[PDB]
Amino acid sequence: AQSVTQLGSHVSVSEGALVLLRCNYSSSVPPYLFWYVQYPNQGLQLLLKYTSAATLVKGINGFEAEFKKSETSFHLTKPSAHMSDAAEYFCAVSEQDDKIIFGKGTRLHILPNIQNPDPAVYQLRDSKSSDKSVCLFTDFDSQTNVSQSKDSDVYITDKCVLDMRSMDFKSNSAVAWSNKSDFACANAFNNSIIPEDTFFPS
Amino acid sequence: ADVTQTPRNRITKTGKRIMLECSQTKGHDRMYWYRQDPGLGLRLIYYSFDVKDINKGEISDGYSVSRQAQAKFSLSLESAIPNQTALYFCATSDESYGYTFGSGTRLTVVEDLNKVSPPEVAVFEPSEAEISHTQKATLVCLATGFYPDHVELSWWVNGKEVHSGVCTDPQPLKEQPALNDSRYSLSSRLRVSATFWQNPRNHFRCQVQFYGLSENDEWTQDRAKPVTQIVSAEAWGRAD
């Protein structure tokens, strides 16, 4: 009815740990409630819904949600976070007997389990270079975050996690680049707090 | 194959009339148009319970709709403006909240078509030091100088699309953040074993599908007409 609330546009969970995404509603009479998932550049897929039957509702992939009227909640849970769970999740509610209204969405970020981090900054060269390169900061654990550049001619991306399925191996990276004659990979990430043991090859 | 919407991707200029079309085969009374924006979820624009019947949703200003048939529900931007840039979804419902969504329309409204520009794409080969230190090898693709922000980047190894070992930035960055019509840049990584990179028979391609002008559009500049197109860059493996 009136509304549905999801707080935190972006949330984290450790790989392997319990997934819990919160949703609350405002409706005097219990509504129907829905959780949808969306992968990048894809559409909406229904995970599960409460339709006044069982209060404990089970969905695809180990997802479940309990409808709790006295705390007006319908939190989505899954036993263990897998890397493939990285997506945007939306809770939604019936309204005015004629529609579904959607929450704002929360994007779930899964922090890979890195037992042996190996932080490094590497320089990479253009495959058909006229003397062009970028810098790759990689193999740091999720206690590191990458800050935006303070130099308007140096570009720095957000950290991104890849999962090399071939070796069951996940890693974080960010990329920096510049046209500047003065630019060096040693200095590229100087506005970020990097591990003290970051590898800087010759 | 119940609910279909057209078009899938569209770039338009400010001021043009645009029509998005939703069709269904089940003949459900209830049809809906929603838009999706980052951080806001799906917001209802308009909805209809019969050919005789139209109802405003929470964000109806700048839109109109028509229920021309049990099967069809059209959404019109009367005079498109840049803040109508969004992903749009039509839906049907049965009488018990069983929704079926269409697969979406990505619409970009640009003020000035003269600023449209395809990406330049480059692949940067793995570092020798990475290879020695880790026995893995990360390629980086950079797509730069493109406008508007309406692209899809994918990786192709020996002619087959790959998803494993890939991470692409979720949003491009602005090359000139102070500018309203800044060009964009996007990066992506593909990581493979050093063994696989070191095989000179292996072929790696980064592909950017760019959405731009159509053949109908006028173009008065000397530079290439910035039509929808694919721009790639490639590298072969190497054992030095």
Author numbering:
A (entry chain A): 1 to 202
B (entry chain B): 1 to 240
What's the paper's own text on this?
The key molecular interface that enables T-cells to sense these threats is mediated by the clonally expressed T cell receptor (TCR) that classically distinguishes between self and foreign peptides. The TCR governs T-cell specificity by discriminating between self and foreign peptides presented by MHC molecules. One key feature that is likely to facilitate this level of cross-reactivity is flexibility within the TCR complementarity-determining region loops (CDR loops) that form the antigen contact zone. The finger-like CDR loops of the TCR are thought to meld around specific pMHCs, sampling the peptide cargo, and enabling T-cell triggering by ligands with sufficient affinity/dwell-time.
We generated 12 structures of the F11 TCR, that recognizes a peptide from the influenza hemagglutinin protein (PKYVKQNTLKLAT) presented by HLA-DR*0101 (DR1-PKY), between 1.58 and 1.89 Å resolutions; 5 structures of the DR1-PKY specific HA1.7 TCR, between 2.31 and 2.98 Å resolution; and five structures of the 003 TCR, that recognizes an HIV-GAG-derived peptide (SLYNTVATL) presented by HLA-A*0201 (A2-SLY), between 1.26 and 1.37 Å resolution. Indeed, for the F11 TCR, we observed Cα backbone flexibility in the CDR2β loop, shifting by up to 3.6 Å in different structures of the same protein. In both cases, these shifts were comparable to loop movements reported in several other studies in which the unbound and pMHC-bound TCRs were compared. Moreover, we also observed loop movement for the F11 TCR structures, which were solved at an average resolution of 1.55 Å, comparable to the higher resolution datasets for the 003 TCR. For the F11 TCR, only the CDR2α and CDR2β loops were free from any lattice contacts (data not shown). Thus, the ability of the CDR2β loop to shift between structures could have been partly due to extra freedom imparted by individual crystal packing. However, several other loops in both the F11 and HA1.7 TCR structures were also free from crystal lattice contacts and did not shift between structures. However, we observed several CDR loop re-organizations between structures for the HA1.7 and F11 TCRs, while all structures of the 003 TCR were identical at the level of the Cα backbone. Thus, we conclude that these loop movements represent real differences in the conformation of the CDR loops of the HA1.7 and F11 TCRs due to the intrinsic flexibility of these regions. Although this analysis is an approximation and should be treated as such, the average maximal loop motion was slightly less (6.4 Å) for the 003 TCR compared to F11 (8.7 Å) and HA1.7 (9.0 Å), consistent with the structural data demonstrating greater rigidity in the 003 TCR.
